Design a protein around this ligand. Sequence first.
Ligand SMILES: C[C@@H]1CCCN1c1c(C#N)c2c(N)ncnc2n1C
Length: 257
Amino acid sequence: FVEDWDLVQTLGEGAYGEVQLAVNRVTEEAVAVKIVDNIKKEICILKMLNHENVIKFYGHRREGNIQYLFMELASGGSLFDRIEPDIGMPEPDAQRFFHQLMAGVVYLHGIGITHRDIKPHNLLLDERDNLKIADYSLATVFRYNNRERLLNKMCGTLPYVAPELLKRREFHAEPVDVWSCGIVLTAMLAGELPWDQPSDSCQEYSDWKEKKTYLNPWKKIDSAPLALLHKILVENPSARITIPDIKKDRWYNKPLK
Ligand SMILES: C[C@@H]1CCCN1c1c(C#N)c2c(N)ncnc2n1C
């Protein structure tokens, strides 16, 4: 369906466009291809990406209106599909995925890139269940020539967004991504999202700020990972734990099955 590649089946759809499995008729190599028709930007960011926990970019092709973004195939599918509703997954699997997600986010932050839509749909698995951060549709530069710029665009997915993104005119990129990593960890350990959005008017958010951890999803989570979620899901982004400090957390470093 494109040059040497056949488009076998749909892998899913994001905001704009669709992702297909592409098998090479000759080589039998299978990749993923995103079919689109802002996009100059995504391509530019995709070409920066070189890390084991980030989806690799292979190259692009415009054929009329349609753009084709060839990227690493994650044959394990999404983290979303490993989260059992109302249960989550075994704590050692969740810890391993969390370690990989941090590795990925440190890498992105280190090249001055914020993902801005971290959630289990955008977290993919290779054939060895290695986590890959995928979909650079909303990704943006927050650091250039060693100068940070504050963000102002509201974007992402409400249950995953940090509260400052609803309250502040401008905010730091990195603590928004840390927050969404904490919602992902909650989802992995409890198989449910704690609130529709982190606003004053959201009773489940108020409950958390009042430390009612006898409620779900918190009552399903062991005390060690929950102590970490206490440091991540902190309303003031300048008091929120940073990744260097996540890497010193007792649960983060706890040996597990
Ligand atoms: C993450 C997006 C969102 C829509 C579905 N997606 C994707 C990919 C991307 N990109 C992707 C990929 N590279 N390998 C395998 N499966 C993929 N799926 C489901």
